[PDB]
Amino acid sequence: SEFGYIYRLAQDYLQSVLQIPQSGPSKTSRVLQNVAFSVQKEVEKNLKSCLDNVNVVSVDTARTLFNQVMEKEFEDGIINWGRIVTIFAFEGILIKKLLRQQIAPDVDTYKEISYFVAEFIMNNTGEWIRQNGGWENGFVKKFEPK
């Protein structure tokens, strides 16, 4: 269940951004939440003028924004863990804007962002992640505290 692992990571991060609790997150998820939230703060400010002109009134508004930023993020076809962390950071920006701006607020639609985030990661970086050690021998080894 490669997709399921990524979905849980994406859901864990969403729940941490939304400050809602839970068993608890894995070591991998804990390391990711720390690094992604750091990247999220930068992206929110470096992308401030573009996000202000986007009002995330629906999930499909968030998905469209996600694709335009993510297909750009991997415009040149190079993958690194820094760019994968930035996917999660952008998921956090989108759930913040959706909570504030969704026309018909529905907490049950929030997890749809985690789903399309996991589909993007799996379908566009899944092979690279595998070949570079996976989440436990690649990502966590690089980013966990030394």
Swiss-Prot record:
The chain holds residues 4 to 151 of 175 of the full protein. Belongs to the Bcl-2 family. It comes from the Eukaryota. Keywords: Apoptosis, Cytoplasm. One of its GO terms (biological process) is positive regulation of apoptotic process. Interacts directly with BAK1, BID, BMF and BBC3. Interacts directly with BCL2L11/BIM. Interacts with BAX isoform Sigma. Interacts directly with PMAIP1. Interacts with RTL10/BOP. Interacts with ING4. Interacts with UBQLN4. This is Bcl-2-related protein A1. Its main location: cytoplasm. Seems to be restricted to the hematopoietic compartment. Expressed in peripheral blood, spleen, and bone marrow, at moderate levels in lung, small intestine and testis, at a minimal levels in other tissues. Also found in vascular smooth muscle cells and hematopoietic malignancies.
